[PDB]
Design a protein around this ligand. Structure first.
Ligand SMILES: C[C@H](N)[C@@H](CCCCCC(=O)O)NC(=O)O
Ligand SMILES: C[C@H](N)[C@@H](CCCCCC(=O)O)NC(=O)O
Lengths: 230, 228
């Protein structure tokens, strides 16, 4: 049996691709599968505009094990948000510790990044990619089905591979109904580049505890969710 | 070549103002007494208006305008090709086209479709691969918007992963007034790499005389002159 937690860093090809709702949905599916979930957001910016990804995940999925660290008021890159506040970025070891303290046998721990993969989270130039290497995490990458997604996905996967960070698959953060030409062909093209784990219905974030759990359980292959933790 | 006579002009993504950058650099080079050609081997979204070579011709006065395939649907070349049922060009086609344009005294700009890793030719051949084959450097068009730092770093990593040189960045559209994020991103980008130009928001709608004035001001003429 597995004596330690499975760690996934949940990154995105950019900003506003749906990382938070994806963390919530995977947490919900895993919880319904009988797996204990912790969600972790080591660096949060935009707190002065109300942003709070951990609180949204608690709302959406009913997750109680929520682990935060740094929060910066302005909705910018951590470096700039920290500077604007007259604060500093956390150290690399603080982020790693925040994650490692969550360790339980057979737990699934989701670590949500701020923006995309190479955003600086700690000094100097420490990114979510470095953190994933420190903790031996795999990366789940949230993508859109919009024009431009194929270049961003491939850039992101190449950067994971460059530091031997394993790819857990793609999740389409928002999937339109009905899907247009571009969206439909993008979903097929994305599925040639990597496994597409889920494509969450557009508007999922505005669902409600009951419907969100139902959406979440239908959205992932149960065989993949089941295998996450042993 | 002993000079940077070929630049591929890529972007961090779609809608970053790549064409207007190509036009503004062509215009600035022309005004530096340099001969210019612009090549856009593969073009999509034509049916919805787009002929990027024509807008370069119009904005910059460029007559040496070269391309190979134009697709109606505003899609990735690969998807547009599949939809039309008409395959993309081959690698050697794009590469030779570019290499034949290349001349001493001339700046040859190659505009990609979308970002760096978009498939332009058969099979899975990207602008990065083309740049490798022709020993070109890459000029990178970026936004000043939230998200640009990740996308820029990702693009520069992908360039360096195949050892294609960074000749620098251009901000395709520089807002007015900047605003907090854009302002910070401009200095952050400058830490990452040299910013060759920041093209004022709205530059794409200027007629040729105003566009020429903007372009001459936008770039360092000594840098531009040095290319050839
Ligand atoms: C329609 C766009 N304007 C562009 C093609 C963009 C392809 C993006 C593919 C992707 O990365 O998802 N076409 C072009 O530059 O000719
Ligand atoms: C403000 C955003 N929502 C996000 C930070 C995005 C930084 C993007 C930096 C960049 O790549 O330019 N913050 C966060 O997820 O806490």
């Amino acid at each position: 049996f597995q004596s330690h937690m499975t760690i996934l860093v949940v990154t995105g090809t950019g900003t506003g691709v749906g990382k938070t709702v994806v963390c919530a949905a995977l947490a919900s599916a895993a919880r319904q599968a009988g797996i204990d979930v912790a969600v972790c957001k080591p660096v949060q910016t935009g707190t002065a505009r109300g942003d709070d990804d951990l609180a949204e995940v608690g709302r959406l999925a009913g997750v109680t094990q929520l682990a935060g660290l740094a929060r910066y008021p302005q909705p910018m890159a951590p470096a700039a948000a920290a500077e604007h506040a007259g604060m500093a970025l956390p150290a690399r070891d603080q982020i790693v510790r925040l994650i490692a303290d969550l360790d339980r046998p057979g737990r699934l721990t989701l670590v949500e990044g701020a923006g995309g993969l190479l955003v600086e989270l700690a000094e100097p130039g420490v990114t979510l990619r470095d953190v994933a290497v420190d903790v031996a995490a795999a990366a789940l990458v949230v993508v859109t089905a919009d024009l431009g997604t194929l270049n961003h996905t491939k850039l992101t996967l190449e950067a994971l591979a460059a530091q031997q960070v394993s790819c857990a698959g793609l999740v389409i953060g928002s999937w339109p109904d009905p899907p247009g030409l571009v969206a439909a062909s993008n979903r097929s093209a994305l599925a040639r580049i990597a496994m597409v784990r889920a494509a969450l219905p557009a508007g999922a974030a505005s669902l409600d505890a009951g419907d969100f759990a139902a959406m979440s359980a239908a959205a992932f292959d149960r065989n993949w969710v089941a295998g996450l933790v042993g």
